[PDB]
Amino acid sequence: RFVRTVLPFSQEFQRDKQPNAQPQYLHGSKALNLAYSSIYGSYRNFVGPPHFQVICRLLGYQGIAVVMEELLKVVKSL
C-alpha cells in the first residue's frame, strides 16, 4: 500500500471543488449520498490493490499503454 508523505514534503495544490447538484444526479437521496460517501471513506487514506483494480478497468489497454509511455517520459526527464 502507498500512503501520504509528511507535512513539509506534502506538495499541495488548490482544487476546484464542484458545486453540489441535486441528490438524484448522484446516489439518489441525501441519506444514500451520506451512506455511500461513508462507504468509500475507507479508500481515501491509501492507494492499493482496489484502486489499481479500478484504474485498470477504467483505463483499459490503451489508457495503461499511454500512462506507462508517459511515466517513462517523466523518468527520462528526471
Binding site: 499511454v66 508517459e70 517520459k73 517523466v74 526527464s77 528526471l78
Partner: peptide, 25 residues
C-alpha cells in the same frame, strides 16, 4: 424564487511541466 432566496439568507444570518507533452494537452 426571490422569496425563498431571501429566506435562506434570513435563516443563515440569524444563526451564525516540460517533461510530458500530454500534460499540456
Amino acid at each position: 424564487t426571490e422569496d425563498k432566496r431571501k429566506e435562506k439568507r434570513k435563516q443563515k444570518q440569524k444563526n451564525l511541466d516540460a517533461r510530458s507533452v500530454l500534460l499540456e494537452a
